[PDB]
Design a protein around this nucleic acid. Structure first.
Lengths: 117, 103, 56, 14, 142, 110, 150
RNA sequence: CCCGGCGAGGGGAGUGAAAAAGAACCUGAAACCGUGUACGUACAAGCAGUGGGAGCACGCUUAGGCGUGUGACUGCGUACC
RNA sequence: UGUAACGGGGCUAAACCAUGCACCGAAGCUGCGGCAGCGACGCUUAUGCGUUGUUGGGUAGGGGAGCGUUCUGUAAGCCUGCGAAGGUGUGCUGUGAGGCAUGCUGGAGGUAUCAGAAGUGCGAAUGCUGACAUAAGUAACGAUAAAGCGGGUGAAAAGCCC
């Protein structure tokens, strides 16, 4: 029984072109380039989830370091100082506080300096 | 009012009243949970930890949902070496809802 | 002397951005006749600057 | 095309 | 939830006056780049232009130690036939001394549209007389 | 009021008609017939007859008043080309394309 | 494929891909690299597996209360009208009326019934004994199938 | 019936269940070529995406964040066989 | 070819040596959620584990298990002119091939479940057939013997007629 394959290549080629929607040039139009676009856009979305944690991590560390040097201490003194007082607050929330509330952050600099110095 | 607590291997800075997503709990949907491992509690006047997990704080929450997140397409690929490997991933979550911050 | 790879829709359009046609916008209303003609050309009937000149 | 002509000879190099 | 983003519309950017008489070039220009970028500000977003405007007046009285005043060589090529042009620090002061502070900042900010945009924050002046007095430049002791 | 009028299989190609359509797109008819008349192109002579048909179908199949009658819409989209053989040097053969096109003028009062 | 064997063009120097015959299966209108032939799909069973599997489907028809034994069961006139009332009465919608003595009376009266197939007790086959909803048998037909299946 | 060259082509009428079934005629995909809206772009360099994200334009329902489109600026990032 | 022998700025310490104390830093490791293998083994026994352990980069290759396509049986049964196949949108859902519901177009076929058999899945072969782009409104318009004007015909005249 002879098998024609027109109606299934619609589904494969269109399944690729729906994901490739939004791409410049032939990468949204031509299937033979859009498959090659979708794969490479799968690798980048796989690697950049790994890089997302580090790229926010240095954002947080930059926020804490900037506000901490406003309040009269470096970042490294502040983090050994937070470790000495046995304070389990991460860099995420601690970078979050320094933007919104300077004052609880300021007391948190004081608790860094108390056990630290 | 905002308090900071560990739930699922990560801290949270939460306002009393609101509706927060975190990692999947072993709790049925119409049930309160009560996180006792609260780190920081701020107000106008602030009392954080100086030990692990202050002395007497608690956080009163209640489950809203046990959903799944949006699907992630994973394409491990190796160019030129005849290899590619699709996969999808939808992460479970728990929508907790804060009803109170104690002191 | 031949193209190394084909240009797009885009760089074709940007080259065709100078093939616009220019409007005339100078159509005189003739003195006697009120007819439309170009500047300095005779009318369709034949009057030029009001004066009939074509005799035809 | 029915008739395809013989290609223009190469630069020697020998 | 989601971390904090700044917004390029609603940032109030302060002004500063740095008198560069008797300094070190890179040790000043480093602090200029850090302030212009906005890595001192607590709301620091890596893509948002956050930093302050800085005026640098008396740029001719910047100093260099060692023998850089007779041997630091500011090369550039004109994009031409062979026209590489070299000029030491001693010429570069006495001709147009905005270029000394201005390069030494320009090589410590990033590139592209953002780093060129926050490079436009800096206002070098060779003399003392500036007329940015209508925009309140409080003194940056550095 | 819609009142389209079109000319299928216009035997001058679409890139050359489409220059003329980029003059009258968005004007009144009274401007359009004259600007098409004094334009020194052939597809002006090929599209003035289309727009002149659009005038008559507007007055005769529906409401009149040519004075308030804009050319809101006009688009030239290309038609079936015609395949002809061109003999060239050294025995090879080319394929010249007698391209045709479809002119559409949509004239309206509002 | 009704064609030639002359190579369509030169081996070298033409810009086009090498090709050697117009009958190739990658070309249009000339093809079928593994063309199929008329074959015999008829496959062999052991005799004991056929007879044994008929014994197994007789078992399954018995334990489901589908296989019906009657005694001598035939029609009187060669008319399908009689078989309509007759198989209405026993509540037999779709059957296998299988008997040991076939005649012109019964077999003609079911040649036009759809859901009825009346076989000779020599000729039962394992797709019918499953492919009917009930099966009704003469006691003589059971007498012969007991012998044949053995 | 009307424009148009007692054209080609077209718009009304009319047949028909349907004329986006009109003879270039069932269905009408894709590449390709346009028109209209929304958003982005004329001081900015690079497999053109991706992670972050402003602003804008629409729909939502609570009245604060969704949904969708575009995507300034930024980290990273040299196609497939 | 242009500095061009710190990556660059720039440095008299931001160099080099000895000592400590921090901190950044990977897809490592740990924390949390989750899937699969394999071996044990409480305690379940064609099935989950309160469990426990390790394990899971992979080309040629070897092994296990899947979805989808057309056709035969089930099926003269069932869905369908209160709208099938096809086409185009959306929204859910699966670990993946995929699936499901449904808005529109189309107008008459489609087929559960478990089985069976293949012309059974294409992006690549200077692959074949058709179609359409690209350079592109680009080169040329086929002898550098040569045209000018009036009248005509015509809807329209440099080319036709006189």
């Amino acid at each position: 029984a002879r098998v024609k394959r027109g109606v299934i290549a619609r589904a494969r080629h269109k399944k690729i072109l729906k994901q490739a929607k939004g791409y410049y040039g032939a990468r949204s139009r031509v299937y033979r380039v859009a498959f090659q676009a979708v794969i490479k856009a799968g690798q980048y979305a796989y690697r950049d989830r790994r890089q997302r944690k580090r790229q926010f991590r240095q954002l947080w560390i930059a926020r804490i370091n900037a506000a901490a040097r406003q309040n009269g201490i470096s970042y490294s003194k502040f983090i050994n100082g937070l470790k000495k007082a046995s304070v389990e607050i991460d860099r995420k929330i601690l970078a979050d506080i320094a933007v919104f509330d300077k004052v609880a952050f300021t007391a948190l600099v004081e608790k860094a300096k108390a056990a630290l110095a | 009012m905002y308090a900071v607590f560990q739930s699922g291997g990560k801290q949270h800075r939460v306002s009393e009243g609101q509706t927060v997503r975190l990692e999947k709990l072993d709790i049925a949907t119409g049930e309160t949970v009560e996180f006792a491992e609260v780190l920081m509690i701020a107000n106008g006047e602030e009392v954080k930890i100086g030990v692990p997990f202050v002395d007497g704080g608690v956080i009163k929450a209640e489950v809203v949902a046990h959903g799944r997140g949006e699907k992630v397409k994973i394409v491990k690929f190796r160019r030129r070496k005849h290899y590619r490997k699709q996969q999808g991933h939808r992460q479970w979550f728990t929508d907790v809802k804060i009803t109170g911050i104690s002191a | 002397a031949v193209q190394q790879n084909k240009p797009t829709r885009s760089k074709r359009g940007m080259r065709r951005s100078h093939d616009a046609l220019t409007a005339v916008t100078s159509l005189s209303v003739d003195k006697t006749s009120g007819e439309k003609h170009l500047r300095h050309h005779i009318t369709a009937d034949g009057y030029y600057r009001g004066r009939k000149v074509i005799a035809k | 095309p029915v008739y395809i002509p013989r290609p223009r000879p190469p630069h020697p190099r020998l | 939830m989601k971390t904090f983003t700044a917004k390029p519309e609603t940032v109030k950017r302060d002004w500063y006056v740095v008198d560069a008489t008797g300094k070190t070039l890179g040790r000043l220009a480093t602090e200029l780049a850090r302030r212009l970028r906005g890595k001192h500000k607590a709301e620091y977003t890596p893509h948002v232009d956050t930093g302050d405007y800085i005026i640098v007046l008396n740029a001719d009285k910047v100093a260099v130690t060692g023998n850089k005043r007779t041997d630091k060589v500011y090369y550039h090529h004109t994009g031409h036939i062979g026209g590489i042009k070299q000029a030491t620090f001693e010429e570069m002061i006495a001709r147009r001394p905005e270029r000394v502070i201005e390069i030494a900042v320009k090589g410590m900010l990033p590139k592209g549209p953002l780093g060129r945009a926050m490079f436009r924050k800096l206002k070098v002046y060779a003399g003392n007389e500036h007329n940015h007095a209508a925009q309140q430049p409080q003194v940056l002791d550095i | 009021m819609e009142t389209i009028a079109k000319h299928r299989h216009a035997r001058s190609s679409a890139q050359k008609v489409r220059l003329v359509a980029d003059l009258i797109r968005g004007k009144k008819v009274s401007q359009a017939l004259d600007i098409l008349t004094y334009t020194n192109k052939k597809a002006a002579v090929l599209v003035k007859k289309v727009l002149e048909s659009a005038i008559a179908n507007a007055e005769h199949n529906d409401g009149a008043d040519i004075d308030d009658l804009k050319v809101t819409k006009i688009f030239v989209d290309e038609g079936p080309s015609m395949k002809r053989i061109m003999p060239r040097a050294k025995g090879r053969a080319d394929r010249i394309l007698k391209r045709t096109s479809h002119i559409t003028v949509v004239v309206s009062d509002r | 494929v009704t064609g030639s064997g002359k190579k369509p063009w030169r081996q070298k120097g033409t810009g086009r891909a090498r090709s050697g015959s117009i009958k190739s299966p990658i070309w249009r209108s000339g093809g079928v690299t593994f063309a199929a032939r008329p074959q015999d799909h008829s496959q062999k069973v052991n005799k004991k597996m056929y007879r044994g599997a008929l014994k197994s489907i007789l078992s399954e028809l018995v334990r489901q209360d589908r296989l019906i034994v009657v005694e001598k069961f035939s029609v009187e006139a060669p008319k399908t009208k009689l078989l309509a009332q007759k198989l209405k009465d026993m509540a037999l919608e779709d059957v296998l009326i299988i008997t040991g003595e076939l005649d012109e009376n019964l077999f003609l009266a079911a040649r036009n019934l759809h859901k009825v197939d009346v076989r000779d007790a020599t000729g039962i086959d394992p797709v019918s004994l499953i492919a009917f909803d009930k099966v009704v048998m003469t006691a003589d037909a059971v007498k012969q199938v007991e012998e044949m299946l053995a």
